[PDB]
Design a protein around this ligand. Structure first.
Ligand SMILES: CCCCCC/C=C/CCCCCCCC(=O)O[C@H](COC(=O)CCCCCCCCCCC/C=C/CCCCCCCC)COP(=O)(O)OCC[N+](C)(C)C
Ligand SMILES: CCCCCC/C=C/CCCCCCCC(=O)O[C@H](COC(=O)CCCCCCCCCCC/C=C/CCCCCCCC)COP(=O)(O)OCC[N+](C)(C)C
Ligand SMILES: CCCCCC/C=C/CCCCCCCC(=O)O[C@H](COC(=O)CCCCCCCCCCC/C=C\CCCCCCCC)COP(=O)(O)OCC[N+](C)(C)C
Ligand SMILES: CCCCCC/C=C\CCCCCCCC(=O)O[C@H](COC(=O)CCCCCCCCCCC/C=C/CCCCCCCC)COP(=O)(O)OCC[N+](C)(C)C
Ligand SMILES: CCCCCC/C=C\CCCCCCCC(=O)O[C@H](COC(=O)CCCCCCCCCCC/C=C/CCCCCCCC)COP(=O)(O)OCC[N+](C)(C)C
Ligand SMILES: CCCCCC/C=C\CCCCCCCC(=O)O[C@H](COC(=O)CCCCCCCCCCC/C=C\CCCCCCCC)COP(=O)(O)OCC[N+](C)(C)C
Ligand SMILES: CCCCCC/C=C\CCCCCCCC(=O)O[C@H](COC(=O)CCCCCCCCCCC/C=C\CCCCCCCC)COP(=O)(O)OCC[N+](C)(C)C
Ligand SMILES: CCCCCC/C=C\CCCCCCCC(=O)O[C@H](COC(=O)CCCCCCCCCCC/C=C\CCCCCCCC)COP(=O)(O)OCC[N+](C)(C)C
Ligand SMILES: CCCCCC/C=C\CCCCCCCC(=O)O[C@H](COC(=O)CCCCCCCCCCC/C=C\CCCCCCCC)COP(=O)(O)OCC[N+](C)(C)C
Ligand SMILES: CCCCCC/C=C\CCCCCCCC(=O)O[C@H](COC(=O)CCCCCCCCCCC/C=C\CCCCCCCC)COP(=O)(O)OCC[N+](C)(C)C
Ligand SMILES: CCCCCC/C=C\CCCCCCCC(=O)O[C@H](COC(=O)CCCCCCCCCCC/C=C\CCCCCCCC)COP(=O)(O)OCC[N+](C)(C)C
Ligand code: NA
Ligand code: NA
Ligand code: NA
Lengths: 398, 189, 177
């Protein structure tokens, strides 16, 4: 829980030899034959299916995030999670994904066949509209589910600094937002209000963007999804701060050079009541390389106007947006390894979230390791310690 | 398994020696089974062929390896058990399948010298295991590309190869194709 | 073309583009062009598929979200005001052109809720063009930096394989010459 590798590493691979104090060892020497050496780690605390506190629950959930990757990269812990991934972790995760991908097909088809005329578009009485009715209900089931599972985590695993962690702290919010935002739409589709739709549309785009949670079952896609969010933090906000700051600067500067419609009712010659707003979009399209200058030219001072837009392109496209590519290259180079290590925390958290969701007898069926009589203890009573074999080779210590 | 007294003596050897063995062997000729006594197929499907000599060598026990051969036991027993197969057959330690192929592959120059120029019997450096693979074929099977491994592989590879030139001044032992052709160089490639 | 069917053409067209793209095999006789052709395929694997996975995932998200905000032709027979039976599909192309920097917004504007619509396309540009496609350039830079040496070494295997494929294709007396 406190992130102390030197003692933590020492305790696990503790091999004492003298006959009295051999019950204190946690790394045995099962068998050897020339240059191949088996070894047998104790999982007494590490893996306890339900009926005890365990180191592995603590590390993956309640510990220091600064070195948690070095803690999950020691002797059984790496191969103990990989073993769970084989048995149940991989499988159950890939039921969770298709269960979710399907639920977002249903939330899609119900939106493409949601009517658009009249206060609440109830009038079902039809095989199609009853099929749509299966859709909205399955949807609301997910919303109330994701709502309770997150508030279950309120009286359970929540309240670290879960707002910007790359270790599911981000998605706990967005599934909550998805959960709230389906409930509100369900409330307004029943309370008459016609903005059930607008509130739904956000929920849909938000929901597919939650399928990036399910890129955690592959280092390939999961490391990628981590770099998206870091770049979104370390690189894109500082870019929009400046970019916005320029934009109000030039836009106000450029609106000032257009004659009012107190003159002849034109936008492309005159300016009135929407001329600021559209420039923000044109000056947005313009830096994105997506809109054309197409000089307005209906201005008191036309040549100052053109000199400014060119300084907007040079600064915002040629210099800021291509610097933005450059900064990403510095980001992805810096946070690649750091993103490999987060994923290992993501992946491990995924396994135990599945495991904890099982009843205890099922966790004991998938119990990892093998029972062993490592030695003799009180009044000759053996040591019935579950353990985890790790075969090894050194062609040096004959 | 099929284990008898003599393995159990050697497996539970301590401090480099154990004086039970010369007596159980002294008792062996009284029963008249030395041939059959230092010879046994553990018929375990993890130990199909292991003998007391395979045990005598892997324990780095020179004193008894000189012994067990002296009473004329075997130096050609094919340790064919699934344990004694390559790691891709579902095994742990391939060394060839022979005591001479072991003593080489287990970094024991003294045994390997002895087993050849020992009086009673001697394993020729030509003998093929149940894959065709001789000792040099087997040194290519255990060599990883590490410093310590590649060191003592090349020494003994030379040693036997230079040594087998003295004897049998004929076809090079490095030319002995195995049961898929591949010579020790082709087998390394 | 012999069984009467007129789709000899469509099947041929794929074969032609596929065939010129097989001339990259013949960049193996130069480290210059052959290392290059190796980095194309790694980037196609290690960098582009993971990009299309996400990109697609966003696109169905927003597109469905944006189709939902257009009034049917059960109203007046228009596409640029109404929506019927091809409106999903074309958005996938427009929202593809849009992230590529190749299509224009040109706000449809014939929607029950027009301002939610514009807020979404802007989030599509920011996420898909400003952030994903320019991150994609960045990732390539990490790829080509990592796999340059590894691509020099593959080419040496390519080049050697080329030589022996030629040699084996000769009769023996010519190989001895
Ligand atoms: C760090 C450097 C920052 C530089 C900022 C840009 C500065 C410009 C300073 C000069 C100010 C010019 C003032 C023009 C006033 C104006 O607009 O006057 C007009 C008409 O036009 C003229 O009379 C000027 C004619 C000459 C044109 C050639 C200009 C050559 C410019 C060369 C330099 C370009 C720099 C390019 C950008 C390089 C940026 C790279 C770094 C990146 C960071 C930004 C108003 O007409 P009016 O009669 O009232 O009514 C209209 C009637 N009518 C005339 C149309 C019939
Ligand atoms: C991580 C942050 C994610 C943010 C997501 C975007 C969020 C927005 C939240 C606010 C919701 C707004 C809801 C609008 C509802 C709507 O559409 O209402 C309408 C009309 O419009 C209004 O009444 C609103 C007028 C105000 C306009 C200024 C908005 C200022 C927005 C500023 C923030 C921009 C964010 C920009 C993107 C920055 C992204 C950067 C990170 C990158 C990741 C994405 C429906 O008209 P109706 O009367 O039913 O019929 C039509 C009749 N009529 C009105 C046309 C005559
Ligand atoms: C090297 C090994 C290779 C083997 C590979 C093949 C392995 C396949 C194993 C497949 C079964 C595991 C997946 C089942 C579905 C599952 O567990 O779905 C889970 C949850 O399910 C449940 O809640 C249902 C409870 C009942 C489940 C068991 C039924 C099957 C029993 C058969 C097991 C086979 C073995 C023993 C017999 C059983 C009888 C007693 C022993 C007798 C001695 C052998 C999905 O996760 P979710 O909670 O949605 O994710 C987190 C959600 N959150 C908390 C974040 C909101
Ligand atoms: C903690 C979250 C909880 C959310 C709080 C908001 C909940 C509820 C507010 C909704 C009600 C407000 C309107 C009530 C009045 C009304 O109905 O007003 C309407 C128009 O109002 C609107 O359109 C309101 C805008 C809705 C969106 C709000 C933001 C939603 C959430 C934003 C977040 C999600 C986004 C994410 C971006 C993705 C990128 C991220 C990437 C991140 C990557 C890491 C008037 O029009 P009218 O046609 O006349 O309506 C019919 C009325 N009549 C005639 C029948 C009586
Ligand atoms: C293992 C490969 C084997 C391929 C299997 C496919 C083979 C055969 C299927 C063709 C027959 C199907 C149609 C029969 C009916 C028919 O004729 O239907 C037509 C239209 O049908 C089609 O158009 C069928 C689509 C053809 C393309 C399929 C894919 C081809 C292969 C795809 C792969 C190659 C690409 C590579 C991409 C490059 C990038 C990579 C970079 C990678 C870099 C590393 C109906 O129209 P109508 O005018 O009425 O026709 C006349 C009929 N009438 C009136 C005369 C009776
Ligand atoms: C609602 C009904 C749904 C029905 C079920 C549909 C889905 C079933 C899931 C099938 C796979 C589960 C069993 C895997 C056992 C196993 O071997 O798992 C792993 C290996 O495989 C995987 O990681 C999964 C490979 C990728 C899946 C593609 C997406 C499939 C869904 C779309 C054993 O660990 P390791 O080799 O150490 O893992 C390292 C991963 N690496 C390097 C081998 C790829
Ligand atoms: C060896 C194979 C054995 C197969 C056994 C199959 C057994 C049962 C089938 C049903 C499984 C349902 C399991 C749900 C588990 C669950 O709770 O799922 C959730 C996901 O949300 C739901 O499920 C929504 C609820 C509504 C139901 C689903 C939609 C409607 C029904 C669909 C079922 C049929 C599917 C597909 C049919 C087509 C299949 C094509 C195959 C093709 C193979 C390539 C897991 O999210 P969570 O982890 O909790 O993450 C939350 C995020 N947070 C909080 C951790 C950050
Ligand atoms: C979003 C939810 C979550 C998704 C997660 C799962 C996503 C995808 C599944 C992919 C699994 C296989 C990839 C394993 C790669 C791997 O393991 O290693 C990769 C190597 O990749 C590759 O070589 C190429 C990869 C691309 C292959 C494409 C074929 C798979 C997709 C299926 C075909 C899709 C088309 C068409 C569909 C048909 C349409 C008809 C209807 C049409 C309409 C009618 C990197 O290795 P390395 O450099 O060592 O990095 C370390 C990573 N390491 C090994 C530790 C995990
Ligand atoms: C910390 C200080 C914050 C102070 C904020 C004060 C907010 C508002 C004050 C303005 C009040 C009046 C607005 C009423 C709304 C409205 O409707 O206004 C319209 C005007 O037309 C428009 O199109 C709206 C233009 C809006 C101007 C925005 C200026 C710039 C605002 C800058 C804010 C951002 C700060 C900083 C960015 C930081 C960036 C780096 C990060 C640093 C982090 C710390 C009224 O139309 P009307 O007159 O009826 O007809 C049009 C005119 N006609 C035809 C009669 C001549
Ligand atoms: C696709 C099939 C396979 C193609 C393979 C062969 C491709 C191309 C042949 C190029 C061979 C020469 C290049 C050797 C370069 C080299 O060896 O080293 C390069 C140095 O390059 C250069 O300095 C410049 C290179 C470009 C020169 C252009 C002139 C050649 C093309 C001919 C002219 C074409 C125009 C017009 C045509 C007329 C039109 C009229 C009709 C018009 C219509 C009527 C790199 O060196 P280094 O940095 O040490 O890297 C290590 C590489 N190293 C040395 C180990 C191999
Ligand atoms: C694993 C689950 C897979 C489930 C797939 C289920 C497939 C299909 C279900 C839909 C059946 C109905 C379609 C009939 C075809 C047709 O013709 O439909 C048209 C509808 O119009 C269209 O334009 C087609 C729109 C298609 C919607 C797609 C939704 C989204 C699909 C998402 C699939 C991809 C999943 C995942 C991506 C993963 C990404 C990350 C990697 C992860 C790897 C594991 C019928 O027209 P009609 O009604 O006559 O007239 C129009 C309507 N009007 C005018 C009457 C109102
Ligand atoms: Na462009
Ligand atoms: Na253009
Ligand atoms: Na254009």
């Amino acid at each position: 829980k406190t992130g102390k590798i030197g003692i933590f590493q020492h305790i696990i691979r503790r091999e004492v030899t003298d006959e009295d104090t051999r019950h204190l060892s946690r790394k045995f020497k099962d068998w050897a034959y020339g240059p191949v050496y088996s070894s047998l780690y104790d999982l007494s605390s590490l893996d306890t299916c339900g009926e005890e506190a365990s180191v592995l629950e603590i590390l993956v959930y309640n510990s220091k995030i600064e070195n948690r990757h070095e803690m999950l990269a020691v002797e059984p812990i790496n191969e103990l999670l990989r073993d769970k991934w084989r048995k149940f972790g991989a499988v159950s995760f890939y039921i969770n994904v298709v269960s979710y991908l399907c639920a977002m097909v249903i939330f899609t088809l119900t939106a493409y066949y949601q009517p658009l005329e009249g206060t609440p578009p109830y009038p079902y009485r039809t095989t199609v509209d009853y099929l749509r009715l299966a859709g909205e209900v399955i949807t609301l089931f997910t919303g109330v589910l994701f709502f309770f599972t997150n508030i279950k985590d309120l009286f359970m695993k929540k309240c670290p600094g879960v707002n910007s962690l790359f270790i599911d702290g981000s998605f706990q919010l967005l599934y909550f937002i998805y959960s709230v935002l389906v409930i509100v739409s369900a409330a307004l589709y029943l309370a008459g209000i016609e903005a059930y739709l607008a509130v739904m549309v956000f929920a849909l785009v938000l929901g597919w963007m939650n399928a990036l949670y399910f890129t955690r079952g592959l280092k390939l896609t999961g490391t990628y999804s981590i770099m998206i969010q870091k770049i979104l933090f370390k690189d894109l906000f500082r870019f929009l701060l400046v970019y916005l700051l320029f934009m109000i600067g030039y836009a106000s500067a450029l609106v000032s050079l257009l004659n009012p419609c107190a003159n002849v009712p034109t936008y492309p010659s005159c300016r009135d009541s929407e001329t600021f707003s559209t420039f923000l979009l044109d000056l947005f399209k313009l830096t994105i390389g997506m809109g054309d200058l197409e000089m307005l030219s209906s201005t008191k001072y036309p040549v100052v106007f053109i000199i400014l837009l060119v300084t907007y392109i040079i600064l915002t496209f040629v210099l800021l947006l291509n610097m933005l590519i450059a900064l990403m290259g510095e980001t992805v180079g810096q946070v690649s390894k750091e993103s490999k290590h987060i994923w290992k925390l993501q992946w491990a958290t995924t396994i135990l979230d599945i495991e904890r969701s099982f009843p205890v007898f099922l966790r004991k069926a998938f119990r990892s390791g093998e029972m062993v009589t490592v030695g003799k203890s009180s009044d000759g009573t053996p040591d019935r310690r579950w353990c985890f074999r790790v075969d090894e080779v050194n062609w040096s210590h004959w | 398994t099929g284990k008898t007294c003599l393995p159990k003596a050697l497996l539970n050897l301590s401090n480099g020696r154990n004086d039970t063995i010369p007596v159980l062997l002294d008792i062996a000729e009284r029963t008249g089974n030395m041939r059959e006594f230092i010879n046994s197929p553990f018929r375990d499907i993890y130990y199909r062929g292991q003998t007391a000599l395979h045990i005598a060598i892997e324990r780095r026990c020179k004193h008894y390896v000189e012994l067990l051969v002296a009473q004329g036991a075997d130096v050609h027993a094919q340790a064919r058990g699934r344990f004694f197969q390559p790691k891709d057959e579902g095994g742990y330690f391939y060394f060839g399948e022979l005591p001479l192929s072991l003593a080489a592959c287990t970094n024991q120059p003294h045994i390997v010298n002895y087993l050849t120029e020992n009086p009673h019997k001697k394993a020729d450096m030509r003998r093929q295991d149940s894959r065709g693979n001789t000792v040099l074929h087997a040194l290519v099977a255990i060599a990883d590309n590490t410093r310590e491994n590649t060191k003592f592989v090349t020494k003994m590879y030379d040693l036997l190869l230079l040594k087998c030139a003295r004897l049998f001044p004929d076809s090079n032992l490095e030319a002995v194709l195995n049961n898929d052709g591949l010579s020790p160089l082709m087998m390394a490639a």
